[PDB]
Amino acid sequence: KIEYILNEARQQAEKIKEEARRNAEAKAEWIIRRAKTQAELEKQRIIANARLEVRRKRLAIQEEIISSVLEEVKRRLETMSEDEYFESVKALLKEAIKELNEKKVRVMSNEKTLGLIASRIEEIKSELGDVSIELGETVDTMGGVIVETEDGRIRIDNTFEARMERFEGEIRSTIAKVLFG
């Protein structure tokens, strides 16, 4: 009847529903595989993230080597040398006046370090050529002679300032052409 039309037309629907069912998956299929390669792109970035972590560690493990070694010459800067500091002060002065090249100087230090200078001035002036030295600072940093000319310029062997602080960088250049490469 007119029912017969409906039956055959809904039967068509059945077979229509099919291809579109069939196709509709062959769709999600491809993407499944496409996301496959997509996620392999991800991995690479995972290996990049790992490389970036390689650094975080390296430098941390690098700064550690300096920090302990600074504190090591800090411990070796500390009171382990007694009367060898006077003949270190002596030495430093001989090393400082030399580069500066002047008859006039003034070595500031810690009060007494700056006052211990007033001792063997003739054994100090004896080391290298003769010169003149007068006055110094007291409330200054400790363990080192801070040479100051009676002219414009002044070189610092004061404390760590140009000593251990200089070494910080000295070591750094070494430790980086090695660690970093």
- Tokens found for residue 146: 């801070």
Question: Residues with Cβ < 8 Å from 45, sequence gap 6 or more?
Answer: none
Place of tokens 């291809």: 19
Question: How far is C-alpha 98 from the chain's CA centre?
Answer: 33
Place of tokens 């500031």: 108
82-181: CATH architecture: 2-Layer Sandwich (3.30)
| Deposited experimental method | X-ray
H/E stretch holding 83 reads: none
CA–CA separation, 84 vs 91, rounded Å? 10
How many other C-beta atoms can be found within 10 angstroms of the C-beta atom of residue 96? Answer: 21
Q: Are 105 and 133 spatial neighbours (Cβ–Cβ below 8 Å)?
A: yes
Helices (H), ranges, 76-143: 86-100, 111-116, 121-124
Q: Angle, nearest 10°, between helix axes 164-178 and 2-75?
A: 140
Domains of the chain, by residue range, sit at 1-81, 82-181
CA–CA separation, 22 vs 159, rounded Å? 84
What CATH class has 1-81?
mainly alpha
